[PDB]
Amino acid sequence: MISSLWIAKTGLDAQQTNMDVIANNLANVSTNGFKRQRAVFEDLLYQTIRQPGAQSSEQTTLPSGLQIGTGVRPVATERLHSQGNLSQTNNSKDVAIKGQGFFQVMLPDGTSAYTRDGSFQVDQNGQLVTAGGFQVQPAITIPANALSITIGRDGVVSVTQQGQAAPVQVGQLNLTTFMNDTGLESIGENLYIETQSSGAPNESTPGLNGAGLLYQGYVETSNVNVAEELVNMIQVQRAYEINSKAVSTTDQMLQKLTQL
Amino acid sequence: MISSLWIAKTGLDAQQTNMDVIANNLANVSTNGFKRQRAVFEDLLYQTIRQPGAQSSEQTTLPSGLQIGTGVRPVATERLHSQGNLSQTNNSKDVAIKGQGFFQVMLPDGTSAYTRDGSFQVDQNGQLVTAGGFQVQPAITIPANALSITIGRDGVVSVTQQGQAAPVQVGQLNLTTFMNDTGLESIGENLYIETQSSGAPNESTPGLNGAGLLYQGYVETSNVNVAEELVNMIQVQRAYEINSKAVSTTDQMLQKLTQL
Amino acid sequence: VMLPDGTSAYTRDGSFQVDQNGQLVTAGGFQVQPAITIPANALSITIGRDGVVSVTQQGQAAPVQVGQLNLTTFMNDTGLESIGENLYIETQSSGAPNESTPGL
């Protein structure tokens, strides 16, 4: 219709994507291990009408020619992989992560995903599974009689038996690091999958090779800064307000064009 | 309507559920043997617009693609099976448990239930019931002429007849251990039942196979930390604040859209 | 930044990332110039006020230097032709790009 209306459409859609990301951040407070998202925007085509070069006289230069430009296409959503805060669950089975790293998990299809969520359990077979029955990697089968479970800062998980007063180690629980964490493709369930932007997953014991440490009895909280979200949401409402006013102005102009 | 309003609605549901859990934990203080509940959350679908991989040109790769995401689906609620504080009740029919294990009970339907409440009773037949006529198992019959009942830390229950200078042994009170204490389903009445998440029940004498000990004259208090519950209450109230603010913001965005 | 074609554009947008190879790319995969490759297990990245980008390692108690974040100044900034993706391109009216370190 009119060049202005498509541009204002792009503005409305971009501000709506901002509100979408803000609402998804806002709702996932109290989601352990959740990572904030933030949209990155990007201007679209610029229709060149006079070239910024394009000599004007036999000597002059025509600086800064005409180009109009459209669109605010949202180009990406970065995910902030900073350390979230801890909290006392006082659950022997919940473990948070001190720094980089991920827990590897085996999906029913046999593929592997990665989660920063320490809300672990034990199923009827003694395997550590994570709130949805996903059997973690590497396998850890707790013996049926076990009284106490401990997980060191280096990850060696060891149980205490009845009578046998020696904390026999039962397994090793190691982390996986990516050289670009931001590029992982989240699939819900607090689970990310490997994509060819993240890089090959390198498995290591905690503490070594740059991976984080392990804190048993804690869970890492979502790193959502709520004040930033409220002020951002005020900003988004006012930006949508402005772009709607642009649409209305274009509409009224096109009115008195038709009435003509 | 808007992709933001559904997300905020899921956020309202999540905070409402978490407040439900907090309220149930809070109200069940002074309920013996009650185990604190804790809700574990998890985000739903991420609707992707640009894949995090998906090389654009022959050299570019487009790191950190654009996907929006929705929802805070409450994935589970764990139950903290830690030893509750004992208090000296001075009653001979209150037996508490020190360590893992559950008393078995016969429901009137014939199937078996399990409970950590020792505030026992003796019914008009003299059998050992629990506040609801639920016959503990295996059935223990207290003779009419008994003056006292003593329940040792080994679970060996005996009574003192009048005249006879001997505590005739009237039975053995054995516990039951499950591999996944958290996986037991709660049916109310402070009673749990068998489910395949829990695993097969292992019946055993108190003391052996990792089962607990019995403390007569003690009651096991609910492990509901009032401080953690109140701070959770504050946080949940504020999260509900913020999510309703998000709903309001999207509503105003929509209404100015409509006015045009 | 270096476009897929091979030529260079100029952006004022700092929303940087890193790709699967460690290169510093700009929200769409265009490699910044000069190339700066963050090492695999860098606990933290720091970018000083003059652009010296460095990282910390797993106990090496000093930030290993990783690269320089140069900028360019133009005689006429308003003359740059914008092409989208928040990228400008050098024209006849902008003059040559005077590469320099920040602060000088």
Place this chain on the structure above:
Amino acid sequence: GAQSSEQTTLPSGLQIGTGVRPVATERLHSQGNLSQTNNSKDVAIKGQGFFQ
């Protein structure tokens, strides 16, 4: 650290910190007082020592 220039060093970098995790509730074994019960079967230890 975080060398902020060719030469500037930026001492005392900013970092926030969280939490007061209690590692333990340890058992203080110090010498206490003694009281007179006048019972031959009641014995008190003065100084280091534990009853087997």
Place this chain on the structure above:
Amino acid sequence: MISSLWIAKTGLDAQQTNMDVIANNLANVSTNGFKRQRAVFEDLLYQTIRQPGAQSSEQTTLPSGLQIGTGVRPVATERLHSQGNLSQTNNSKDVAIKGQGFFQVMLPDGTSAYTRDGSFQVDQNGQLVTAGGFQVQPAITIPANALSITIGRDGVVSVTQQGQAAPVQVGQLNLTTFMNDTGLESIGENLYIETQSSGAPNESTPGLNGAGLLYQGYVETSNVNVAEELVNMIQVQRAYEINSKAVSTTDQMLQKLTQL
């Protein structure tokens, strides 16, 4: 959106970080050896409109030009390394430090950590560690038949052997001092690691080379002045109220700009 809203956003973030610092100090009372934290703020760019010099006429000069300015960027958080109160813990295994100095520790990764905590403990191999098996430096082994362990104010550790009436010299406990105590990067666990701003560590016996003395049987308390933290918390609550008022005013300005 509006410059006012960006400036106020930075103000809210700054007050939030200040309150975070205050809350961390407040929570960490009664934590041995903890050092108070103080946030230093620093305004962001000043966007000039009329240059403060910039001769207007050929004789006048335009003093004090117009520049607007933004932001309150928190530049640093220094850690006050002042001596805390010593309290008589009466334990033969708690040693405080009177004056500058840190106990060096070998991490499982092997890199050198440092702690100002004297709650030393002994593992199953008899050596000296600090609450987690962190093998102190230099290597010290308490003999199995040792009865009382004294840590002299000079820094020599000696044990009272079985039978022999001699407190045999069994090891040396020597401190480390830095040029920049404030620069040490805390990594939790009451541990500081050397950083390129702390300066090279200088190892020396306690009492010499400027290092402090060792007080056996004492513990050093966190130097947290509770009343000072209270006044800081009142002040930051006021400042946050004010900045939220600024955001509200900017938002109302915008709202009736659009309603126009």
